Design a protein around this ligand. Structure first.
Ligand code: CL
Ligand code: CL
Ligand code: CL
Ligand code: CL
Ligand code: CL
Lengths: 381, 383
């Protein structure tokens, strides 16, 4: 928030904000999807049910798990609408801490999403790290991850990013996830999937939901926190869903009613607007096909600008390796710049990143990529 | 369980059925009512996240609407405020904040007959809801002397929850004279008032009068909490729009609390929904929309008070010899009818009129089309 306010107050004409949390188009503008503009809104403003607009919840389920999913056919998954991904993470955590014995710890990647620590602390669970990011390669440390998961106490809650890891952009492959998931099954761990970027990551909805789809048949309980903030661009409308797989329809009904008991004394019932939009889009074959193509356009721009930054760096004469910038996936990139280097980019060039070298690559575009590349070279050469 | 009453009502095949358990306003033709001022409000151009504490312009207008145009506390910057998920979110976030400024914060006092969700809201924030005397079932009216005595004997520095107006579920409100006495006790005993104001303007059609309680208390005590809902008064229900206000001694004190509010909001839901904030901000900043809104408020509040008054006259015209003056003395959408459990059940079984077993009637479900029938049925089961 401080980097935002400083950027805003900075008088320089050439300034660039690479600390934002939101997608931007090539003209650095906010981007309301056409499928969203074309969506049909509700006719009244009556409160939705505590657990959300039923049609929205059902489409969220199908989008997450696929329309063929056995768990979903059998009614084994307990679901509700939530205040973005954040609300799902919180409600999920509050549910675990009430109902899992000695659920006072949750394991997440060593470099991870800032709000997770406080979300789970409010739920009475201490975020503990497992090995994940390798700063030498700005890449993955699988062996370290597998080992930490294998040695975590049986029945540990394991938090994983489904794709487009935030803030590094470092994702395991599907092959890697197969190994990770086997360890989770064998150690009877409870996987908690934060899926904030389905489809936004690679432009492929199915591929991007591999983690929860693969885990759902492997473990007794899978938790998924699903955000529609980025992939429908619905940020400030606060729209997401929480999913918890269970053994049976009857068990799922009992969990939903326990979800209601957490939701009611928090905010009573959830905001309509985002639920309308997502429900309307996913039930309309024209809006759904448009949405899919818009997702690909967002995801392709991000991957193309990453690839452009790398090629511009080479054209500027950089002799350092930037291949991590193209291997990483999604909106957030751990650049591998040092604190000193980040500070000089700010001071001399008015390019704003976090001090850990995270760059929101959505803030790069046709208009500024060349300049940012030159500056990055100048400060690393 | 309004939800069960809803589902049964829907599934009931009878030709003549009436739902008096609803939580929302309806017009005379039993339709949901989106205010014209709301339909005419200017919405934002993008969907980016609002700030954790809400759209600044919204929060400032919410403050002025609550406390008025000549509030010194507001001029001096002593009030810490944020946008919330309806009145519910303000109650929860407020409660979760109390231990920043209230000592030994494990209990909160509320009226003996009160808003159902309060118990659970404050239990989640670590506080046990304890009753003070308020509703008199003999008169379906107020028991002031019992309220004053409970407040006087509550331990010093107790948190006291009060409904600003249109008490839910009974419709029994103290007068301003009564509130003066209540507020003196709260000041003298160093109690901390927590005002749930869900019906400002919706209650009587007068925004200033309806906000008397928080306006009167704000100069009398070191800390006042207000949970403000825009669900009923702007008809914004399912958009989840409200604000939370906490008075303090100084701007510096307020700044600290706002930043602590942020720390509660972020790990709960990150930041609040735009739509309702846009609407309320746009209306309150436009003199033309504000005037329209004020008129529409009066229309809503007049219909509720006229249908109460009609039920009473129809009861008399049916031949009822019982007293129903409480129905007209009560204020707002909810009325404790004084019907017994047995009587509520017979209305349901014999007449297909649905209310909660406590005799609460959502009067907004009464209109030109059904008031006569409901009156006859109420007479038949009470005579
Ligand atoms: Cl695969
Ligand atoms: Cl480009
Ligand atoms: Cl009306
Ligand atoms: Cl007065
Ligand atoms: Cl009438």
């Amino acid at each position: 928030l401080g980097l935002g306010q400083d950027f805003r107050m900075d008088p320089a004409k050439r300034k660039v904000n690479l600390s934002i949390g939101v997608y931007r188009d090539d003209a650095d503008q906010p981007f309301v999807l056409e499928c969203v503009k074309q969506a049909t809104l509700g006719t009244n403003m009556d409160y939705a049910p505590v657990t959300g607009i039923a049609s929205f919840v059902e489409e969220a389920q199908k989008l997450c798990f696929g329309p063929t999913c056995a768990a979903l056919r059998d009614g084994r998954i307990a679901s509700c609408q939530t205040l973005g991904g954040t609300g799902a993470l919180r409600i999920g955590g509050d549910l675990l801490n009430r109902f899992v014995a000695n659920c006072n710890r949750i394991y997440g990647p060593d470099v991870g999403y800032p709000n997770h620590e406080s979300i789970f602390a409010k739920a009475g669970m201490e975020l503990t790290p497992y090995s994940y990011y390798d700063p030498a390669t700005k890449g993955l440390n699988l062996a370290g991850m597998l080992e930490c998961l294998d040695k975590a106490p049986e029945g540990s809650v394991i938090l994983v990013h489904a794709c487009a890891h935030n803030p590094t952009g470092v994702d395991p492959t599907h092959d890697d996830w197969r190994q990770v998931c086997d360890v989770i099954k064998r150690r009877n761990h409870i996987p908690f999937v934060d899926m904030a970027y389905q489809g936004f990551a690679t432009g492929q909805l199915d591929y991007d939901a591999f983690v929860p789809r693969h885990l759902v048949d492997m473990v007794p309980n899978l938790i998924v926190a699903q955000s529609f903030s980025k992939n429908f661009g619905l940020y400030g409308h606060r729209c997401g869903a929480l999913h918890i797989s269970t053994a049976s329809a009857e068990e799922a009904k009992r969990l939903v009613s326990q979800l209601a008991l957490l939701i009611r004394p928090m905010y009573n019932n959830p905001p309509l607007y985002g639920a309308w939009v997502v429900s309307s889009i996913l039930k309309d074959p024209q809006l759904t096909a448009l949405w899919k193509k818009e997702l690909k356009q967002m995801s392709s721009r991000i991957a193309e600008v990453r690839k452009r930054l790398v090629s511009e760096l080479k054209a500027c004469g950089s002799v350092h390796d930037w291949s991590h910038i193209e291997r990483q996936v999604g909106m957030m990139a751990y650049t591998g710049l040092t604190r000193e280097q980040v500070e000089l980019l700010r001071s001399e060039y008015h390019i704003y990143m976090t001090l850990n070298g995270r760059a929101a690559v959505s803030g790069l575009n046709s208009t500024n990529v060349e300049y940012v590349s030159q500056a990055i070279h100048n400060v690393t050469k």
